[PDB]
Amino acid sequence: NKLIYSNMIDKKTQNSVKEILKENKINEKDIDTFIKAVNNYNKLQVKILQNNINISKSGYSSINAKQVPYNLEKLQDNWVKKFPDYMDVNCRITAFRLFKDFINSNKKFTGDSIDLNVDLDTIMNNKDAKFSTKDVEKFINFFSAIPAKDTDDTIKIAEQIKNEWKKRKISFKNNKNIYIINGFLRYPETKNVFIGHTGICIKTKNGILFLEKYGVTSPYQVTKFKNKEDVKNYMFNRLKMSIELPDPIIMENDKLM
Ligand SMILES: [Cl-]
Ligand SMILES: [Cl-]
Ligand SMILES: [Cl-]
Ligand SMILES: [Cl-]
Ligand SMILES: [Cl-]
Ligand code: NA
Known part of the structure; x- marks a missing residue:
């Protein structure tokens, strides 16, 4: 298919994105925090990014590929060398930076949150991932792996995800044109499912x-899709770029997408 995307290198696209963010009621403070991370990241990796033909210097680009090619190995090398004491923010943290206020969470999670160890370390040591105690508990409660029954029926898994979030007293604020796409991967080895990408x-x-x-350590990307179908397919291609693995469970809030 075709991907129309921006890495937010230019200030005009950033301004554009900010407007849309502000229009959807995202806290302006969090928008600024997100944008500073974007610039801070871009500044750090600019010499690498500028050698990537697929990254736009201004406006949106287009490519007939399943994913935008990035020099993931060199980007990670540069991060580790310059910031050796902690990790960059990831998909979960970034998604959360923008959408935490649209999630209700009323239960502290004291289950198995081993899958978030890196994330939690980043939240403690990386200014880009600063969150209040309430928001950190929400983060853990929302993204901790969900117990699964090793079923390969996506519908059944989706229902277990929904049920588990209900048991955790998680709900989504209603009447919004902004929603979170969670790409769950099943891990039979640990009898659970976990958000691999978001x-x-x-x-x-x-x-x-x-x-x-x-x-x-990877870049930020904003993509313009025609419909939700292309978004689902995009998440799939991102999760399936990783021989005998279970298909992903792509959730749109608490509903199978
Ligand atoms: Cl192409
Ligand atoms: Cl790159
Ligand atoms: Cl590493
Ligand atoms: Cl809350
Ligand atoms: Cl607090
Ligand atoms: Na790596």
Whole structure:
């Protein structure tokens, strides 16, 4: 298919994105925090990014590929060398930076949150991931792996995810054109499912705008999709770029997408 995207290198695209963010009621403080991370990241990796033909210097680019190619190995090398004491923010943290206020969480999680160890360390040591105690507990309660029954029926898994979030007293604020796309992967070895990739979806007149932190040490990417179908397919291609693995469970808030 075709991907229309921006890495938010230019200030005009950033301004554009900020407007759309502000229009959807995202806290202006969190928008600034997100934008500073974007600039701070871009500044750090500019010499690498500028050698990537697929990264736009201004406006949106286009490529007939399943994913935008990035020099993931060199980007990670540069991060580790310059910031050796902690990790960059990831998909979960970034998504949360923008969507935490649209999630209700009323239960402290004291289950198995081992999958978030890196994330939690970043939240403690990286200014880009600063969150209040309440928001950190929400983060853990929302993203901790969900117990699964090793079933390969996506519908059944989706229902277990929904049920588990209910048991954790998690709910989504209603009447919003902004929603979170959670790409769950099943891990039979640990009898659970966990959010392998995530990003925020915003419906506009042009279609749908998807925002994400491509991965830790990886670039930020904003993509313009025609419909939700392309968003689902995008998340799939991102999760399936990783021989005998279970298909992902792509959730749109608490509903199978
Ligand atoms: Cl192409
Ligand atoms: Cl790159
Ligand atoms: Cl590492
Ligand atoms: Cl809350
Ligand atoms: Cl607090
Ligand atoms: Na790596």
